[PDB]
Symmetry: C3
Subunit: 414 residues, 3 copies
């Protein structure tokens, strides 16, 4: 079976890439390779990333337009309400789990908040669709007292495109016969993009191998990081594993009484792609393919939930942010009252939506939680030493939550 062959090839890609990176580092790593030969060594992973980012846009737009135009606006609204409830509850549970793990294990033994949320709202409503295709609104500060002035910076505004696609699909549904032509157009475009996804899946193993090989070759050494941040890394990774292997599967089983680990086997490939790429947006294409044809999720439910979740639902990001907040508080020996914990949870849950879903997109918002909850911000300099791995662990769970919620809402629809 080609699906099992692809899954095996992706697992072997991850393992052999770890092995190749370890062997290259033992042979000297970047210093032995040199900057030019190092850049040439990690290139296939960059090609995989580029290939995925090339199709993020048309796939997301067309799939969401078709999905929103495939349902009654009332039914679509109810489905979206349930999906948002599931996303929010899972993110809150991940935040609480992260805080609890950080408090129990005790691993620790900028932009304004208002400006961050206003930028979120601005990106939700893009001022230009073509610009939104490759730029997002971001606020910097001038001194005149700090005055916030904003501009469009590099980075696809996936959130604004998602919102516009949903709204445009609802409009097409409202049109009736006149909008059917555009529905057919976008469905055909999405099917072609899905064919491209199927072709890119076969290159995904090589890209993942080289991604992981380069990222572990880029390290100074395992000891230098772990001897100082081992308990923090353990907190983050263990929370991710508990949420993805126990909590989320538990919820799926209780609401969808089917074997969740079969569902996870059906998406092993996009999970490894998320680990390799460290971005939910780039692995979303593969996740949609697998969830549609490897599992029994309906086409419209998948194409409506997965793209929305990949931008709004981020359980790993919230867990990492809470663990980081508690770790920084413990480093400074700051007291954490119940109000303080609730504030951490709420701020992490709210910022997870604003996370751009791109590599190193959690540290940008971590300062927001460290500001809402007054804590030393400079200590983030430590987290960046291990963010290259915690971010991948976060992306894995982030896309896993999307897939499991899509399955759960498929069961609810059925």
């Amino acid at each position: 079976l080609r699906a099992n062959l692809l899954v095996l090839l992706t697992v072997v890609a991850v393992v052999a890439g770890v092995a190749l990176g370890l062997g290259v580092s033992g042979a000297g790593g970047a210093l032995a390779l040199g900057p030019e030969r190092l850049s040439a060594f990690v290139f296939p992973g960059e090609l995989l990333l580029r290939l995925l980012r090339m199709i993020i846009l048309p796939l997301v737009v067309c799939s969401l337009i078709g999905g929103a135009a495939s349902l009654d606006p009332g039914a679509l609204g109810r489905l979206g309400a349930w999906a948002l409830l599931f996303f929010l509850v899972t993110t809150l549970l991940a935040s609480a789990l992260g805080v609890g793990l950080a408090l129990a294990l005790q691993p620790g033994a900028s932009k304004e908040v208002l400006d961050s949320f206003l930028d979120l709202a601005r990106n939700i409503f893009p001022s230009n669709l073509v610009s939104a295709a490759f730029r997002s609104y971001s606020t910097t500060y001038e001194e005149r007292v700090k005055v916030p002035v904003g501009q469009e910076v590099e980075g696809m505004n996936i959130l604004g495109l998602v919102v516009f696609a949903i709204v445009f699909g609802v409009a097409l549904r409202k049109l009736g016969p006149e909008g059917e032509l555009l529905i057919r157009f976008f469905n055909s475009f999405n099917e072609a993009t899905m064919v491209l996804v199927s072709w890119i899946m076969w290159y995904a193993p090589v890209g993942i191998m080289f991604l992981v090989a380069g990222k572990i070759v880029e390290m100074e050494d395992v000891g230098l990081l772990f001897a100082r941040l081992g308990k923090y890394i353990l907190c983050c990774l263990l929370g991710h594993a508990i949420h993805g292997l126990l909590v989320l599967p538990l919820i799926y089983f209780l609401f969808t009484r089917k074997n969740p680990y079969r569902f996870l086997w059906g998406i092993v490939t996009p999970l490894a792609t998320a680990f390799g790429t460290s971005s939910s947006s780039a692995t979303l294409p593969l996740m949609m393919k697998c969830v549609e044809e490897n599992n029994g999720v309906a086409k419209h439910i998948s194409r409506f939930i997965l793209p929305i979740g990949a931008t709004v639902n981020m359980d790993g990001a919230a867990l990492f942010q809470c663990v980081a907040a508690v770790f920084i508080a413990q480093l400074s020996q700051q007291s954490l009252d119940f109000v303080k914990i609730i504030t951490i949870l709420v701020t992490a849950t709210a910022s997870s939506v604003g996370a751009a879903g791109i590599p190193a997109g959690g540290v940008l918002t971590l300062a927001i939680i460290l500001e809402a909850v007054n804590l030393p911000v400079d200590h983030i300099s430590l987290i960046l030493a291990v963010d290259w791995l915690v971010d991948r662990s976060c992306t894995v769970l982030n896309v896993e939550g999307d897939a499991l919620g899509a399955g759960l809402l498929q069961n609810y629809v059925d």
Copy 2:
């Protein structure tokens, strides 16, 4: 009736926003609110602006393609000739009225001209459509003697998109059966964008309220501006009122013997949206909706004239530019001969086309008239103190001229 309800809500939005801004300023204004809370206070207006600018592009492009493909190229050429004649004559009349008011009341008691027009011509023929969707060609100067070097700067090139849409629609018409598919596609897209416009119209009241509230909260105080520029403000606003309430309605009545104030009631909402947003491009979406369904203008005539006029026809801009030129000449006590007045009129009429139709887009060209007609340029520093209001007054009349010309050409077609 929902139309009358929306009109009443928009009028109440303008009035209550003025009241809210006055109350906030009396309570202290920005200093009492603070920069963060001020930014949060004016946000809904920015959201309305973003929502409108999001749909300017697809609406303009699809509507113009469909309109140009809906008529015989000869009939389309005759319609465009009549529309251009009407626009030019109305702009010349506005320029003459502004000059006459400035001379009678006597309120006054950079980029090269060639480079400005070459940039206009370049933007008319965009070098890239995707870039034109969010950028426009602009010329800066290097010293080597000043050499003009140009680049693409932020700002949608609505003029180039309009020209390309008209040309592409004519091409589709030339194709015949083969082009009908694209005509259907663009008509469906425009209808969906019009549904989005209908949804945005219901948020327009809140956005307008907050826009006006913030803009009058941003003031230092009414006295500081008026005690020095009251007669200039009076000249500009009175010329706008005379042109929009007497001259343009008079022309509409003589050429279209119907009550023009009923037509103006049919578009009160986009007029208030223009006042709030200070941009003809952003209020064009709402103007098209109203002119199509609130008045009896045909679909093709509206979708061909309104988008063209919103970029080419600007009577308020020309009136303001002439009043500013005469005001600056009177400040410096410069003599204005008949040749001088004719030059002012011609330059203002020509630059009105080049005006980008965006907030504060008239002061950019005012220097062009002050250069063609040698006058002190530095004095523009005064006008910027009141441009926030004169520009809104200009945009109101600018969109009003579009609507009335669309009605007049509808009568001519009938």
Copy 3:
């Protein structure tokens, strides 16, 4: 016949533009005209360039999608293999001819190579289609040892768009009935863009006249250039003439036993447009029109080969690069062994693909050959004095090779 009238008008445009430029230079040139009047003088050529660049994008994309969707993937693969073989062989022959001419006549009596090829590969796989529509990936260097860091710089990524269009057309072919709607859509769009091309062809004469008039008016004087670079100019131009009038027609005749000069008469107009614009991308629109309706090349074969070749096949560029390499080696009296010559040929052939097909796009890569083959790079400062003409001579042959290969593959298909 309108075709012969257009050809005559374009030839007269070239000749009369040379005459006008010579007359203006004799009257003083830029100094007599002045910077403003000079900028106004050369404007029509810039308008022609903008008009062509406006349609490069939709034309290339839609034509390639339709062509790739019009053939069986196996047949399309065989056609592409033959086209690539022809392109590579012709480019190698041009490189060898340039090297031989430089060695016989002896006219001579930055970015890393790996980074250049990695940028080529990145542009082949664009990370964003909207960004690719007007930007291309380029690598600069930071000092930390030089570390290569890359970003998107201005310039349409025609190569990535070509690859994506071919892949998307193959995907549409794979879809079957569901993809036929998109095939029809893109065919209609390409036909409309071709109508626009037909309209732009009639303005092409004026633009070409003013282009050549300005470019020869921009000169200091013929003597200052020729008295020092005459034999190099002769080598380049004579190699181009030999390849375009003897070698390429010879190959066409042997593989397609028809009069090649009739085929060249059929494309005289795009050849002169290439000479005037100095860009294969901008003249590709006209070349497609002529090759389709002036000669007997099939629609799909043209729309598949011409856009691919205009980015991949550049015989003139390779010839110029080889002549420049040998000229610089002779200036420094560097020995050229057989290995050295083979390296020059291979590097020029490989870099010709990476050439962006835009004015002055050969000198960017010339340093790549001068680095792979260690030679003084500074001497390129001389070539820039004559690149304005050699680049045009290169573009002529570059598009001529595309047209002749399209005809040859048409014969092969027949």
